[PDB]
Amino acid sequence: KQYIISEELISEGKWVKLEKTTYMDPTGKTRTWESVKRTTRKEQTADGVAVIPVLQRTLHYECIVLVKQFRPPMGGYCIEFPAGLIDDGETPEAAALRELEEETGYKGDIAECSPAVCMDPGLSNCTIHIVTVTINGDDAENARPKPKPGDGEFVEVISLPKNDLLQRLDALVAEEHLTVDARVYSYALALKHA
């Protein structure tokens, strides 16, 4: 039933644009919507990746490796899965491993890679691949992991035990007052609910 009729540019920045979307509703009636898109999407299957990095270490409980960064849109610090945009020509897997190493120091191994999933589909067309990666924390490469953030990138690494993730996130929100990302929180809830 439903489909896009037209997409009219309202305002284009260097990184984000706002569009007026005209579409057909399922009664046969024309309607509009205000849509956000990035200006950076080329032929990638998605804008970005987010990495679920499972740090595995003999005689350690598995940890989820998370990052803490100031996010200007939020006016504050956020706790998130390591993530970044996919470069032109780059694979989601390569972007995930590259971003994980830049943001955390760790060298991971691919486990799985999602289809493109929507970030906030009532608002934007933004999508990511969610890439699950295992980190062998017994490898010497992963012993003293040094973040290599790019220009204007400033990231803190936070590893939390998988078996207590939701309580440990609740403890950081109690004591350091930041925001947890919705995907991180969703993953932690499901670890509890399973």
**Residues comprising the binding site for Mg(2+)?**
83, 99, 103, 153
Burial per residue of 135-153, b for 16 or more beta-carbon CB atoms within 10 angstroms, e otherwise = bbbeeeebeebebeeeeee
What type of residue is 91?
A: T
- Residue 15 in the binding site for ligand K04 (CB under 6 A): yes
**Are the beta carbons of 129 and 44 closer than 8 angstroms?**
no
Task: Report the residue count for the chain.
Answer: 194
- Residue 149 in the binding site for a copy of itself (CB under 8 A): no
Q: How far apart are CA 81 and CA 119, in angstroms?
A: 13
Residue 182's binding partner out of a copy of itself, Cl ion, ligand K04, none, with CB under 5 to 8 Å set by partner kind: a copy of itself
Q: Which is closer to Mg ion, CB of 19 or CB of 101? A: 101
| Residue window 99-138: x/- pattern of binding to a copy of itself, with contact defined by CB under 8 A | ---------------xxxxxxxxxxxxxxx-x-x------
Q: Which residues are annotated as a binding site for substrate?
A: 15, 33-34, 38, 71, 85, 120
- Residue 176 in the binding site for ligand K04 (CB under 6 A): no
Q: Are β-strands 3-12 and 16-24 bridged in parallel, bridged antiparallel, or unpaired?
A: antiparallel
**Are the beta carbons of 49 and 96 closer than 8 angstroms?**
yes
- Residue 170 in the binding site for a copy of itself (CB under 8 A): yes
| Residue window 62-91: x/- pattern of binding to ligand K04, with contact defined by CB under 6 A | ----------------------xx------
DSSP-derived 3-state class of residue 163: helix
Q: Which is closer to ligand K04, CB of 85 or CB of 155? A: 85
- Residue 33 in the binding site for ligand K04 (CB under 6 A): yes
Helix axes 165-176, 182-193, angle to 10 degrees: 140
- C-beta of 162: minimal distance to Cl ion in Å? 9
- C-beta of 11: minimal distance to Cl ion in Å? 42
